[PDB]
Subunit: 409 residues, 4 copies
């Protein structure tokens, strides 16, 4: 079976998502900063709205895959579980006085239940009584130490971050913050072992949860197949150039793409992922955070045999939207601006995900922006941002397209 994503707006057929879970249940106001998450959310309500999100997509024929289901299914294949535990439970990871115990107990659990733990972390208290466990209990008691052997991963919720389907293949992203590489470990397990992938046909363009990668980091929110052989990769805090460079070579090498357009975010706005300030809604329509998007320096990177490293990159003086426009054959793109005329209040309606050309899913709260999408012709299906929103992520961040068709450019 052919898996691949060939645009940003085209009809979406298979998307992978992750509902908030045990991970989020462990968020306290003090530990949410060092567990890489915005705030504490109402978990049971966040699940209900996510399920509402999952259903408004499914109701339209789209195949929607929840990470916990895939993981549960994957874990039943002994080989798969062993591949994950061998790399997740090590002396270096949990301490030599706990690997043995930790592993036997996780292996003693029902599939589903295990997935929940592989995703939401495992605490000292979750283990059966022991010396291993008790020693940890006192490090928390007497020194203030963390009581997580296996840390939660609430950010699994944003399936967009961890991996990226770029045409006929996927990247296994080396995550910027080391603790988030545990998420890639699991989505890689799924793609490597689960039946829906293990047989399917697709290329692995970059990544390896075994290697270290060093300063090569890459995050999903930065990558985009817009079609027409083009790929937009934002280069700021999380996506380094040493990665972006390899992804390009790898792609050019198999003719996946004819041009990688590197979108350089200025230091100031560099902590923002590209799909946070720039999103597609239709063949030629985008939402944009003006102040930022007008400051992006576009760089075209394309194939070149006259170079040893087989590539050419030229700075671009035309604006980013102009480069984007021209790389799609269009005279120019229409633009809706988010983040002062007749705005009733500040809203940030970037990060909607297209279900097909002209149909989009966004947040209820961005009424003003959502209104501008409809006057410009987009059907805007909304979900509640109340709990999912407190995550610094929208529809786009919460979806990972696996199968999406292209459009004529």
């Amino acid at each position: 079976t052919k898996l691949g994503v060939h645009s940003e707006a085209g009809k979406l057929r298979k998307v992978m998502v992750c509902s908030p879970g045990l991970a989020h249940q462990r968020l306290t106001p003090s530990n949410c900063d060092e567990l890489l998450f915005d705030d504490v959310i109402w978990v049971n309500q966040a699940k209900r709205d996510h399920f509402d999100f999952v259903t408004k997509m499914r109701e339209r024929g789209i195949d929607v895959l929840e990470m916990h289901n895939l993981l549960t299914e994957t874990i039943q294949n002994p080989e798969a579980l062993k591949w994950i535990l061998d790399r997740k439970i090590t002396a270096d990871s949990v301490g030599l006085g706990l690997t043995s115990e930790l592993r036997s107990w996780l292996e003693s659990l029902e599939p589903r239940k295990l997935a929940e733990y592989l995703i939401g972390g495992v605490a000292a208290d979750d283990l059966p009584a022991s010396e291993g466990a008790n020693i940890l209990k006192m490090y928390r008691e007497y020194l203030g130490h963390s009581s997580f052997l296996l840390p939660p991963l609430p950010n699994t919720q944003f399936t967009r971050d961890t991996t990226c389907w770029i045409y006929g293949g996927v990247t296994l992203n080396p995550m910027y913050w080391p603790a988030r590489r545990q998420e890639t470990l699991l989505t890689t397990a799924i793609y490597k072992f689960h039946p829906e992938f293990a047989n399917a046909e697709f290329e692995i363009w970059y990544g390896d949860p075994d290697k270290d990668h060093g300063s090569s980091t890459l995050e999903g929110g930065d990558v985009m197949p817009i079609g027409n052989g083009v790929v937009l990769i934002g280069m700021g805090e999380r996506s380094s150039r040493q990665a972006i460079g390899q992804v390009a070579q790898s792609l050019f090498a198999k003719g996946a793409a004819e041009r990688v357009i590197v979108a350089g975010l200025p230091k100031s706005r560099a902590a923002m992922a590209l799909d946070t300030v720039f999103s597609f809604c239709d063949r030629d329509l985008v939402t944009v955070f003006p102040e930022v998007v007008k400051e992006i320096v576009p760089f075209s990177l394309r194939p070149d045999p006259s170079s040893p490293y087989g590539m050419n990159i030229r700075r671009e003086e035309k604006t980013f939207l102009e480069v984007v426009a021209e790389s799609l054959g269009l005279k120019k793109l229409r633009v809706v601006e988010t983040g002062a005329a007749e705005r009733e209040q500040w809203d940030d309606g970037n990060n909607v995900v297209c279900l097909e050309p002209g149909v989009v899913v966004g947040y209820d709260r961005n009424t003003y922006t959502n209104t501008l999408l409809r006057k410009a012709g987009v059907e805007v299906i909304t979900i509640s941002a109340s709990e999912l929103g407190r995550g610094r992520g929208g529809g786009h961040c919460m979806t990972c397209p696996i199968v999406r068709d292209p459009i004529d450019y």
Copy 2:
């Protein structure tokens, strides 16, 4: 024979590293990115450092400067291939500049090469090219850093990345990934340099080629104090994943009988043991009361009825009484820091031998209590080296130091 057998014993061989190029590249905008408090005065820092160095040599200590060692190591082609093969990859430099950075480095005169390896290399140092130019373009227009090879100003603190523990040394996996680059350099040195290659010594833990994950260790936390005992501070930068493993290895070669895990409280977990607790004599320690009284001590011992061949108990006593009894002592003479003219932190001095310590010129009170309690306190200037947070102890990596009759 290489080996550090106490904290107060007569010191004969130590490794230090003067500030240099890495510190010339400090900006007030990149301090934190590079993990360095503030921008020092380099030329003046090098003089103050040299003075510190000279004062030890005059006591007949064999002081080895990290740059000298590296320069001599990289004259060995094999030594150099080992390093660049790990330091210059697609992943660290980007596939567009691996050949031009490498060759260019290979073309320089040895000493200049070691200055660059430790001090970083920017886009402008390299001859004009496509790569160089785009790296520059990224700096100009996106404000991006433009280091093909980033500076390591913390090399100045040789105590951090490696530890000599009796007849052996740890190759410390650093909390910050950035600083594992320093461990790679010292490793090359202990591997190839003559001073080490032929020498006998065990490598207890660490390996610059592996990913230790959550295992991390910082020199300031380790102290082989004698009597087969090793103190290891446990906080933000030295984990139990790491410490547990160090203990197991030490115990597996009889290199030690017991490790006492100094549990630092969460408020002070950012502090390295050697920065709140430091020996000055056979039974004398400067101290940071507040923190030291809250350390939870843990005794680690070998136990054949343990799946990991170890045993652990929480000491009901204070950290100071536990250390005291570990060395056969009763009390521990203590000078406190943190009446007094002002505030001064006199922790972190380094002993050259019993009763002789090197400390900063600025901590007068603590300095005079140490002379009153019987210690010769050589003083060095803090105005630049001290902005860097580190003291005499953080600036020295003991290689050979004699034992003490405990």
Copy 3:
């Protein structure tokens, strides 16, 4: 008539609240910190959740007064408006290049709008085209400077903060951040000129908007009338002893109170108002954040004739709760500790009457426990109003509440 708050759990008859409004319409992520507010909220949806709040209170028969409405009736009285303006529009606040315009203009608007601008702030664009407002637009465009003639005051939403009703008198609070004393001005105006306050009988224990209070600050979530001449007051980072001492003295001096129990909040915690880690739900039932409440040092401050300054202080050895328990004539208070599913902070509910309290819907656990404890919990949504860091208790200013014994 006669106004006054006489307990924390007694039947509530009159409360003042403030709805999110133009203030919050002005929140941007790059200013909601320098304007003090956890985050940008969905304004219109917060208005609805607040109205739902007012509604659940009104239907139980409580007289709910609204700051904008109250302010609006107030400034219709030219005297009242001239008093507020003379103090809010000066060269030290608006600047000498705008005082006559910004004033002339506000004065030409209808009461309901003028009032929205006083709570909502006023930007340079709002002012009628003038050389003055334009150089400010100029400073905004070129310098990235605030272009606000008058501030936004988003925290008016939390009415519990700026004034405290204690046994038949009120405290007009000296606020910590000077950029919040603007709130206290407006409420003083209301209590001064509005018909429901002008004529009613009540005292002014402490406070005055015309004075600079130096280090004496006071915050309402720290003040609680619990009953027989007792007043609890938190001593964090927002309520200073220089202020707590003068309120205590004035209270004693006037017969108003017999003992003030100073709640000593520990160093780390001293950033939380008392009602945030401690709240009443019934005659002998409170919610508490254990970590904090077990560490608070209680201090009894009583009147003393033989004292030069009329008072005496004794550090109590009983825990805060035993002390408060004994102060109320009780053997022990029941306690639902909050702060089984997930984390949640059920504190900060406001009693409507003994046993009935209004809280947030998200705190399932804590409310489930509170109901097992005999309390009927009416809940509202914390989705947007909750991004404010405060709950039902922070959002209400009791004006009339019956005793209990």
Copy 4:
């Protein structure tokens, strides 16, 4: 000569400075953050670096006034002691059960002692044993409260900030922050009561301790009477537009200045005060921090009888440097740029006279440039004094400096 500063570069005749002292002795790593200090400094070495600097001006003829010295003399006039105490010691500042104690005691001290404490702040421990100081020592003991009745005023050392002489008069500046409001009081008492000030003719252009001022703040570093009736006032985070326009209105009214050029800085909350980025070294010289100065937006403020508020603001079209030069009747200003061996920041030097500045020894690069441009650079140490974010200029309050065009 009557009092009045008439330029930035002309001959310096009288200045006020303030050396480190008891306030800096009170700094501890746990509080130097509030009191605005990059780290604790070595107080006695700081005092020697301050004096040395005082001595380098004193030997060149400048009459240098020292704040502890002036306050001290000032204190000896009872009325002046009452004025201060009556405002520094209220129930609002110290509290009900301490007002009598602190005052009765303070008034027991000898002049040089009282001044010490006024600036260095009074603690609970300094008071005679009493219940009032004990209830205050209990809060510290059990809640962790501060021990300061009166808070230390270490920023006094930067006398540029709290008051400015602009031509024939001065401003009493309503400071931005909290741990700085109390300073202006002291210097206002010196200017009102002290002999050299009480009897001299001069105007108070703006300011008053006794009033609130709201969001009207002005900080000296931003004010520069550069002569030719032009006054320069930087507009950022501590100098508000409400104070600036009032200052120009009183100046324009008594015809002391003809134009006030507002240098409006771009945003950031890092403070960043005009003299820390733009400094005069000579009648046509100036040091500049490129990154920031090119971003400044010039605004001219001149008087206008017709207009309502007797002045009119017209934004400028050429850069900050061309408008300044143009306001001085100059073709262009020569500039030395700061921040090629290491990073440097040599702004903030202080002219003693045309072509003679005083800066820091650490900024060798910018200083060589400055000497090459015809200026004599006298140097002082930054080791401790520049740990406080200020140089010669932030450390001086000119009182008498002649007009340029000489």
